[PDB]
Design a protein around this ligand. Sequence first.
Ligand SMILES: Nc1ncnc2c1ncn2[C@@H]1O[C@H](COP(=O)(O)OP(=O)(O)O)[C@@H](O)[C@H]1O
Ligand SMILES: Nc1ncnc2c1ncn2[C@@H]1O[C@H](COP(=O)(O)OP(=O)(O)O)[C@@H](O)[C@H]1O
Ligand SMILES: Nc1ncnc2c1ncn2[C@@H]1O[C@H](COP(=O)(O)OP(=O)(O)O)[C@@H](O)[C@H]1O
Ligand SMILES: [Mg+2]
Ligand SMILES: [Mg+2]
Ligand SMILES: [Mg+2]
Lengths: 120, 371, 373, 178, 411
Amino acid sequence: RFRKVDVGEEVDSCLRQGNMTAALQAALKNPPINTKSQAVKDRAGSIVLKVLISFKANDIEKAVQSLDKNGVDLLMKYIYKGFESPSDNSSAVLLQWHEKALAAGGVGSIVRVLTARKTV
Amino acid sequence: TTALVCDNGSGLVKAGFAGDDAPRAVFPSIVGRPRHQGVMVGMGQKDSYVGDEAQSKRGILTLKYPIEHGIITNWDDMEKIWHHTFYNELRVAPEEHPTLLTEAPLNPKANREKMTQIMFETFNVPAMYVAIQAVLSLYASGRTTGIVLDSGDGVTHNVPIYEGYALPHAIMRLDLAGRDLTDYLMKILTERGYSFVTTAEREIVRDIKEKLCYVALDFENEMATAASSSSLEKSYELPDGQVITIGNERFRCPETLFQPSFIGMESAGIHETTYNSIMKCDIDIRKDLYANNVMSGGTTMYPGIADRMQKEITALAPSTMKIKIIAPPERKYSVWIGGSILASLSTFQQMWITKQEYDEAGPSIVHRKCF
Amino acid sequence: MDSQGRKVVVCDNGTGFVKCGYAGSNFPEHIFPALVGRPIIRSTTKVGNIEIKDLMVGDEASELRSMLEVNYPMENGIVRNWDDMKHLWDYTFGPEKLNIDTRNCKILLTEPPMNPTKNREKIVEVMFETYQFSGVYVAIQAVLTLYAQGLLTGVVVDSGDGVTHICPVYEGFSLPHLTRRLDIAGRDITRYLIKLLLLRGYAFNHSADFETVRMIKEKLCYVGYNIEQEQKLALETTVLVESYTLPDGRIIKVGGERFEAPEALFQPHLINVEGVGVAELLFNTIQAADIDTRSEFYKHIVLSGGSTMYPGLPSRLERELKQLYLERVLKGDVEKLSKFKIRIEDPPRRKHMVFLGGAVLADIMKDKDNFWM
Amino acid sequence: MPAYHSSLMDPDTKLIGNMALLPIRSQFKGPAPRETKDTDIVDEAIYYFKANVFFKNYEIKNEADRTLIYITLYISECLKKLQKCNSKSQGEKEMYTLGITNFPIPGEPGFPLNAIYAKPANKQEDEVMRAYLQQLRQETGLRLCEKVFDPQNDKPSKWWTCFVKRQFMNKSLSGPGQ
Amino acid sequence: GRLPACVVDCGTGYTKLGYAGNTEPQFIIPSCIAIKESAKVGDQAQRRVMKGVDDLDFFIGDEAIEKPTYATKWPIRHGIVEDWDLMERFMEQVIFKYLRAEPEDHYFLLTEPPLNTPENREYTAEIMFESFNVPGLYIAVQAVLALAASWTSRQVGERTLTGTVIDSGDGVTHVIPVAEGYVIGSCIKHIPIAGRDITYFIQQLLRDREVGIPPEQSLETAKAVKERYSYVCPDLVKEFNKYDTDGSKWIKQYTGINAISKKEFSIDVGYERFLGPEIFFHPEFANPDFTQPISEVVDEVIQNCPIDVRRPLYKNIVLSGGSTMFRDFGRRLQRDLKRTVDARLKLSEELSGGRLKPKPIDVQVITHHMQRYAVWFGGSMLASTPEFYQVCHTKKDYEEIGPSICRHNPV
Ligand SMILES: Nc1ncnc2c1ncn2[C@@H]1O[C@H](COP(=O)(O)OP(=O)(O)O)[C@@H](O)[C@H]1O
Ligand SMILES: Nc1ncnc2c1ncn2[C@@H]1O[C@H](COP(=O)(O)OP(=O)(O)O)[C@@H](O)[C@H]1O
Ligand SMILES: Nc1ncnc2c1ncn2[C@@H]1O[C@H](COP(=O)(O)OP(=O)(O)O)[C@@H](O)[C@H]1O
Ligand SMILES: [Mg+2]
Ligand SMILES: [Mg+2]
Ligand SMILES: [Mg+2]
């Protein structure tokens, strides 16, 4: 009986400007991280995965290398967002950014994604 | 037509047709449910035994009593007892027969009301009534005035009556009776190296209470003499063939009625309780109550209880008064025989709560018509 | 100690472990099991060069048990083999271990409550007829807990090897009629664990084997906090499975039996015993007490005896009391329960028959000790 | 448990040593006197032998059991030799040749049960042990010769030879080696 | 339903097949399966693993005891199923060949040995529901059925529904008390002594003495002498003295036929006759680590049962399974219990000064002809009833829950 009742409880203007690396540098300006908002977090990703898919493989190396250490850590949080619901083939591109990003950031850039208490 | 008299006391249920001289059926108010999983598919069907089956099968059953201290505590089990009473024990269907139930004083009114609701809604009786158990005991004696003492299994109470007028302010009650006397015996046998603990074995400790215990006429002399010799060391058999034998435990249990401090209750004993109730009565009644103490109920069956009680009141009351104790031989059935007399009475045939009155007023009618 | 320089000793006479020390010591000096036994030749064992006396006793009889037919002289708090009982004390006070070796120094005895009177009296005989002790006292086993804990009001839960007791004490008054026993103790949990491992296909049957499953019990078992959560974690995942090494080196593996065995304290119907679990027997005791005293017993539950050591038992016990109070006192008025101040004294030190309060605070020199008479 | 433990330890009998010295009925010579009744510790070990060897556990109930377990081991050693005998006559003399062999006395090393038998403390026990344990063996052999060889053909009788493989709780009076 | 339910009882020695309502099992067969063999084609590259349809070339029962070109396997040991691959192949051929049953249209009653682990009740249920699509299964406690077989056979004046059953089949012996139709699960005991270990003891006891027995047939002859010549004796050492003095006549002769050469061979049969059955009374003869005589294990059971039922349990002990058939096996167990029980009462006389004499317990041990199949016959009389069809698990319940519908057991 008794024991049953529990108790105890702007980006487009840089992209079409050709030097689209300047767009990605701009895409990192909109983190929702500190906010309590949730619809904005769905907007934040869509503004970046549209960018990630645009790169030629001739550039995806420098597009990582031109980031600062925060930039790589920032990027990895966007990478692990696209994997949560892939596009019809875009996983083929995220896994290619991941290759470059992990080369720059090392596994340490993953760990402060796993431990990130507030996120984009 | 004929009324049914049904003493739904705690302990032993008693039922039978009014006007008969002794109950047609008596059986224990216990409901027995199996304490091991039912697995011999076939004969081993019943999910809840009641009465004499449960008392018999007790080895495999967790017995429980649905009346605690005179207050009904599990109504689903109680309904099974009444259902057992009518359809199996009396073998008379309730729809044709008005029922005299009976109850202890100062019970919660919810007990009286729900007992009536069950009677009209489930068993569909023609009519019913709820007498207080004490005045029924006074009827059985053929007595116009006396102080009734019912000592049941779960309640002991005094009701003083004069010229058939009751004295409500002098009614007093004690929740110590044959059950707690048994639970105390089930302790003090451990002093001697036995052990009874299961609910079935509590039925064996009751049995020995009935056969061997007696009230001491001089308790301190009895203690001192019990230490002298094995002259008290009566012997009794368990169902296993183990033999147990008992000394001063024989009287220490009965004595609890006169010294409730043994079970740690603060109330005075039955003797001082009886005298206290007479001292509440109006002064000219008192002399006549002293001549008409009437004992009732099984707990008053112990050898020497009438004499011990006489001695105590004779010391406690004024020395010119002639204390006498009416202890009828049949006093175990006194309540039921009293009901059988009332349900035969030509005047009482107006007093029923008739069905249409409950249909009008609902359960609260019991407080209008019943005492 | 005495102004005469005499020393004073406490023996718990425990049903499973004798526990001994001098007055005022915060620790027992010697803990040893009450085994007494005789040499037996066994085919399954190489007979060593180690000398076996014609009666091994105590700690020695536990380590060399592989050659020994062992008895417990004490069962359920009653001496059932009085000769081995004498030999166990004759070992305790001899040159080995607590070498007082003398009549002159005092001994305290601890008796369970509701103890068959002849058991008590034979101890008081042999202490004065055989050791001829100069000073003896028999103390209420329940009060010694509160002396050691430094309290005067509270309800003592005292699950030893032999029997479990509950005894309220209110501001030092003994309330006897609120005593209760529950016949579940460390020995029955062990036998029940034997049966649970028998289902997993390990056979244990020698008297020497009983000590081994006791050592299993003490190291792997625990009491489930939310028994539904334990069952799901057993069903869903493997982590509860853990190894143990028997004396012969068999690497046996034990699983959900780690919690299914201790649970019997809360569910006596898993063993043959018909009754209520420790929490509900504790709750009914408080509820029987006089109405104003209940307010303090809920705040001063006190735990004693080795069978209370099981990981999580205080937490499990507190849960069942809160839920019982919600169900039967607050009548499901859940949010009110924030007002129910309940507290369990569960100090990690819990061989809780230590002697400081019972001896030195009771006598340095006094007429209280019974004496040669 | 219900293995056959030694019956003869009537307290009126002398109890020299760590074992019941007992009145071995024989025409050999030794420290023990002559029993006159028809039953004796060597006859007891012989009688219970076929049962005792199956019981895989055996207590020492009293001092006489530390005798009986040794007599049993020597009886086994008799069978370990008589089985080879070509006839009963050899079965007697080739048994006497066994009795006077230097068996490890229980306190001597290489005896299998040194945990169970205390050391003999002095010559007047040790030399008594030499003079008692031979008197056991010398007699024990001559009793088996009469009843292992069934009289039709002085074959060593099959039923007895079955037990050659079985040893009382798997202990051997060969010790760690002969 | 119209078609009868199947009752399939599987033991470690034998299995017992037939449809419910029959009075008697329609097949009794040994619990053996003879799988195909190879000249080390199975090896470290792969062990006993088949291809194509090579796995269906096997047989079970007596069709598998005497085939030369197959390796005999025994899937059930100590009553527990040890290798479910072979057991599932065994079940298939039971159903689709021996019983001719379509599993999709007959209820199954199938037996639990009271020791078995819950995982084995999952796996056995996974077979019948998920491999065979049985419409409903029930897993019955073997001992309770054995009592029902006594109950319907014995006279109506003593159909007590109360007794202790001793079920010494092969594998392990169960001692189980039933009071008024309820299993007292707390008191069940298991004794490891059983028909296999009595066989093995006799096999060793022969092979030490009586070499000449060909290695292919040692087991067969050990079984024969166990079945044909063995008896429970009155006093162990008194038999050894009788066998020595009257060795002309207590000794017996068994003649066997050589399976290969068809020459006969003979062995002298002797101490084998009373060793063996006395392993129940001296379990340490066969196991290092069990020692209580069966006559003292059965006492502990009743003495743990509730005080009221104790005497009735002594009044009605039922013997079940084949090993309990040994000559005098009832007589001795009754004598040992009687000698124990009335001596226990002699104590409680003296603790009361002889002032009262207790009504002595009579003890009865009951042998009845069903003993070789009382478990199946009980099963048949259960599975006949219309009640049985509602106690079974309907297949949908296996869909909604997992196989976990068989985790529960009444112990
Ligand atoms: N000699 C006796 N015979 C029968 N009952 C006795 C005797 N002595 C004591 N009793 C007790 O009396 C009680 C029965 O009383 P009961 O008829 O139930 O009263 P009520 O029905 O008014 O509650 C039982 O507890 C029974 O054990
Ligand atoms: N750490 C532990 N965990 C679980 N059980 C334990 C632990 N320590 C001791 N026990 C058990 O407690 C019992 C002994 O407790 P103890 O207080 O000495 O009893 P007693 O004093 O009555 O002999 C034994 O069953 C022992 O196995
Ligand atoms: N005449 C007999 N005497 C003694 N035991 C027998 C006899 N005949 C058969 N047996 C034993 O009965 C067993 C038959 O199988 P049984 O034990 O009934 O089923 P299960 O295989 O379920 O245990 C045989 O293995 C054998 O051990
Ligand atoms: Mg009454
Ligand atoms: Mg203790
Ligand atoms: Mg079987």
